[PDB]
């Protein structure tokens, strides 16, 4: 689940939407999806649900790029899918590059202890996956 504050760039509109705003108003919009091929494809949202308030961790990546998600949220690492609570300053994550638009790999900058905030839930067509804070991790 994604925490409030996470930005979501839409390929259809080309702007930046906030999950807190997209879910609260279940807005029929689109998002970027990822497959096992590593390629990015736009996909519509067909479900919006609130996950309640729970503890979440903050993953800081080089460039300031940060992502807040639940410990059960799986992150796309070099070794497949790994729970966020299993990430330590040294784990590399895939982040979308606006320069080449293509997928790129970067190292973490610092791990942020658990906190507390509202969390949301989405459903991307079938390719359960969405781009959040430039980072690609299951919905």
Swiss-Prot record:
List the top taxonomic levels of the source: Bacteria, Bacillati, Actinomycetota, Actinomycetes, Mycobacteriales
Report what the protein is called: Endonuclease PI-MtuI
């Amino acid at each position: 689940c994604l925490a409030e504050g996470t930005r979501i760039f839409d390929p259809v509109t080309g702007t930046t939407h906030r999950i807190e705003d997209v879910v609260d108003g279940r807005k029929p919009i689109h998002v970027v999806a990822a497959a096992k091929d590593g390629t990015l494809h736009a996909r519509p949202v067909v479900s919006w649900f609130d996950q309640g308030t729970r503890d979440v961790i903050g993953l800081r990546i080089a460039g300031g790029a940060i992502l807040w998600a639940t410990p059960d949220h799986k992150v796309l690492t070099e070794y497949g899918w790994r729970a966020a609570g299993e990430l330590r300053k040294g784990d590399r994550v895939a982040v979308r590059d606006v320069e080449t638009g293509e997928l790129r790999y970067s190292v973490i900058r610092e791990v942020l202890p658990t906190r507390r905030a509202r969390t949301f839930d989405l459903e991307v067509e079938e390719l359960h996956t969405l781009v959040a804070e430039g980072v690609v991790v299951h919905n």
